[PDB]
Amino acid sequence: MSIEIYPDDGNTLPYQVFLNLENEHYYAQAIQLAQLFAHEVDDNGQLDLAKALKKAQAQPDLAIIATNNMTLKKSFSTLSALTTTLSEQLKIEGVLGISQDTYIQNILSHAFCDLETQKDKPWFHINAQPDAGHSVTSYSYSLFIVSQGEETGAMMAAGPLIITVTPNTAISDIFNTKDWRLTLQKEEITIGVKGFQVVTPLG
């Protein structure tokens, strides 16, 4: 995994990889697929669904299992729809090596009052435009992850991208161009290679 070569001196990969994406089980999990992942990725070093979908076919245990996304939006409608979709798709808030909570109440708490989620997750940012009525200030995550099965010794190659659509549209006065209506969606593709028991060391 990573660069580490010979010709140059010992480091010169055109893939420039070493810590290009976050994983929480990198201890050995980034290694299972390492030589696979170092092959079909993009110049950054992340799973490319065009080529790495073939790379996935060579994963330690299984292959491409999940190419799922989420659709969350808010609007001066009712949260009867807003939170409903959020909860249903709260599962894909990283149900890889899920945490102790990472669920409702710890997440749905801010749903009760303006779910800006305290700017949850260290996402990059490609925000506001010069429009003042038809803009979008969104901050994009996407880093790529891997997980560990301890039971049987499996793993899981994950590659999510996250977009926080919070627009720069202007005016919420005598009429709104919709300056305070928000929307959040994204895509996580995940190559499952394991005997997944529960969200935990998949086995």
Which helix (H) or strand (E) segment holds residue 30: the answer is helix 29-32
Interior/surface letters 135-154, b for 16+ CB within 10 angstroms, e for the rest? bbbbbebbbbbbbbbeeebb
How many domains does the chain contain in total?
Answer: 1
Which helix (H) or strand (E) segment holds residue 116: the answer is none
Which helix (H) or strand (E) segment holds residue 86: the answer is helix 79-88
Q: Which two tokens stand for residue 20?
A: 């290009």
DSSP, collapsed to helix, strand or coil, labels residue 85 as: helix
Cβ partners under 8 Å of residue 165, min gap 6: 136, 138, 182, 183, 184, 185
Question: Residue 121's domain spans which residues?
Answer: 1-203
Dihedral sign of CA atoms 84, 156, 159, 23 in order: positive
> Obtained via which technique?
NMR
Strand (E) positions, 49-179? 64-73, 138-140, 145-148, 155-165
Calpha distance 29→149 (Å, rounded): 9
User: How do strand 155-165 and strand 145-148 relate by DSSP bridges?
Assistant: antiparallel
